Design a binder for these strands. Structure first.
Ligand SMILES: Nc1nc2c(ncn2[C@H]2C[C@H](O)[C@@H](COP(=O)(O)OP(=O)(O)OP(=O)(O)O)O2)c(=O)[nH]1
Ligand SMILES: [Mg+2]
Ligand SMILES: [Mg+2]
Ligand SMILES: [Zn+2]
Lengths: 381, 152
DNA sequence: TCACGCAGTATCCTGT
RNA sequence: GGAUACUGC
């Protein structure tokens, strides 16, 4: 993909591929609340990194128009305000307030850098994507069981991670404090680059942590012991040794000198820890420190946060921010995600059904199913 | 201005936040909207001026008193009466003073019988009380004998 | 360079 | 004791 080719393709996509009808269905939420779509904030990033916010639109036609006119490189969705953002200058000071917004989570592979060995920075590979695969299951289950949020849209971020939009009416009316509470409840791996032991579970395992460890276990052997090989050599297993009390460290080292496979080393570590009881949760702390999602509480706490819009185009990879089907999560491949160049090649190879002829169709289908569920909830209620 | 427009013209005026005028220099639509807001504010000011009859009333008051119109429209009461009496005295062959380079008892408020009354209450009020007192008893500079705090 | 009078009700505070 | 408001005429 040639990023110099981005300015050539962006218009066509925004003209014949961007799913505006479903997009308006989403952000309009069945028209129940008046001025809901009209008070939504958008922000655009144009060529040469020119940023504009407090953009609002009257209806789908105005949005389609101004978007096709601007051809933005980035589209971010923001809060629904007390008035129309376009007229925020006209609103008396203090009377312009963000009132409702989806509850959103951003999981970014870059935040896992201190604990992955295959890639670094913005590089991803099939060996590390399983971490995202774990996160979506660990988090989404909580959101479906502990909090009872029923309408959850998971979206690929385009490069390094995934976003989650929780759109239940209750989740859209949550205050800042309630959002911060939700984020802290879901958050376990606490600390920066200056801390080595980032998980310190108490004697009692809270049911949520038990279910997160249960989800982790299913994948741990493949991710950590086979793929990541977190015990390949001394430079790496020294870390895991650094994560357990010194008392057994020596006892482990000799054992790790006689083990040929990291699965064997894990068995040995588990046996040694079991023999050594307050430390019976130490293996769980290691698993969490290598597998549990990291959440930027600043992303989810603030109501006025602008997050990458679904079906955006990644300025560098060119991939489309496509929704991820929860059931088919295990089959999701971030490298097969349609790029803008591929879908423009597909478009120029054959009115409201043009996208069905591209590789974008199944993802718009997943989005349509999610919107159908939202409509059913709006009606039934 | 907002309250004045609300109370006189019976219309709603939008307010441009002070922090948004600077940011409005990012789109043609917003800048034109700002200019139109200024135009609408000017129109509101002119409409308020017309409604109260500020100008004709100022002219009438100035003619009655004898001051300059700008002084009348600057507000205040001392200058108007000053010029009224100046003209009155000069016309009648008098030498007016030289321009400068709770002090006494006022009205009487009867002690009320506080309560609720469900029958007709008749209010009797005097017409131009103090002016009529000045006329009736002939109270003036040239009539009362003052002496440079007792009632003359 | 300025600015009308007086009678009356309601609320709130007194460290360096 | 003082200070801050705004009604009446
Ligand atoms: N200095 C001064 N005196 C006033 C003012 N308003 C009222 N007064 C005094 C003088 C009036 O003669 C007296 C009587 O009050 P009123 O409201 O009944 O007015 P007045 O009787 O002069 O005329 P009216 O009953 O309205 O036909 O109160 C004022 O604004 N300034
Ligand atoms: Mg009277
Ligand atoms: Mg006293
Ligand atoms: Zn990798």
């Amino acid at each position: 993909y040639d990023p110099a080719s981005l300015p050539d393709v962006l218009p066509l996509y925004y003209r014949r591929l961007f799913p505006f009808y479903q997009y308006f269905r989403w952000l309009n939420y069945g028209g129940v609340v008046k001025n809901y779509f009209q008070h939504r904030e958008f922000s655009f990033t144009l060529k040469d990194d020119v940023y504009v916010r407090y953009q609002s639109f009257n209806n789908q036609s105005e949005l389609e128009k101004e978007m096709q006119k601007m051809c933005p490189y980035k589209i971010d969705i923001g809060a629904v305000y007390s008035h129309r953002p376009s007229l925020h200058n006209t609103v008396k000071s203090g009377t312009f307030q963000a009132q409702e917004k989806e509850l959103v989570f951003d999981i970014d592979m870059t935040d896992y850098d201190d604990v992955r060995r295959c890639c670094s920075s913005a590089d991803i590979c099939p060996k590390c994507w399983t971490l995202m695969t774990i996160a979506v299951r660990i988090l989404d289950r909580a959101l479906a069981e502990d909090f009872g949020f029923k309408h959850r849209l998971w979206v690929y971020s385009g490069r390094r991670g995934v976003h989650c939009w929780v759109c239940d009416d209750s989740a859209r009316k949550l205050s800042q404090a309630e959002r911060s509470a939700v984020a802290e409840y879901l958050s376990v791996v606490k600390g920066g680059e200056e801390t080595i032991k980032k998980v310190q579970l108490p004697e009692t395992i809270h049911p949520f942590i038990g279910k997160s460890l249960k989800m982790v276990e299913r994948y741990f052997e493949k991710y950590a012991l086979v793929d990541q090989d977190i015990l390949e050599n001394k430079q790496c297993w020294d870390k895991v040794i650094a994560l357990v009390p010194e008392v057994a460290r020596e006892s482990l080292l000799r054992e790790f000198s006689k083990a040929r496979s990291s699965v064997e080393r894990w068995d040995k570590l588990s046996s040694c820890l079991e023999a050594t009881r307050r430390y019976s949760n130490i293996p769980k702390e290691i698993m969490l420190q290598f597998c549990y999602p990291r959440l930027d509480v600043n992303v989810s706490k603030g109501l006025n946060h602008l997050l990458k819009s679904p079906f955006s185009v990644h300025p560098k990879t060119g991939r489309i921010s496509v929704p991820i089907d929860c059931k088919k999560l295990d089959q999701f491949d971030p490298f097969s995600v349609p790029t803008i160049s591929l879908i423009c090649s597909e478009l120029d190879n054959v009115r409201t059904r043009d996208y069905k002829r591209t590789s974008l169709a199944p993802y718009i289908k997943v989005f349509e199913q999610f919107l159908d569920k939202l409509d059913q909830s709006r009606k039934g209620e | 201005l907002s309250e004045l427009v609300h109370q006189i013209l019976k219309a709603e005026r939008v307010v441009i936040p002070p922090e948004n005028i600077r940011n409005a220099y990012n789109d043609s639509v917003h800048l034109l909207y700002m200019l139109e807001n200024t135009w609408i504010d000017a129109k509101f000011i002119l409409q308020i001026m017309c409604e109260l009859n500020v100008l004709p009333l100022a002219l009438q008051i100035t003619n009655i008193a004898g001051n300059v119109m700008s002084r009348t429209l600057m507000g205040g009461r001392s200058e108007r009466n000053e010029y009224l009496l100046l003209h009155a005295f000069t016309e009648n062959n008098f030498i007016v003073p030289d321009k400068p380079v709770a002090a006494y008892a006022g009205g009487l408020v009867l002690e009320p019988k506080v309560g609720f009354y469900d029958k007709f209450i008749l209010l009797l009020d005097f017409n131009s009380l103090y002016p009529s007192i000045i006329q009736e008893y002939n109270i003036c500079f040239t009539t009362v004998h003052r002496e440079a705090d007792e009632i003359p």
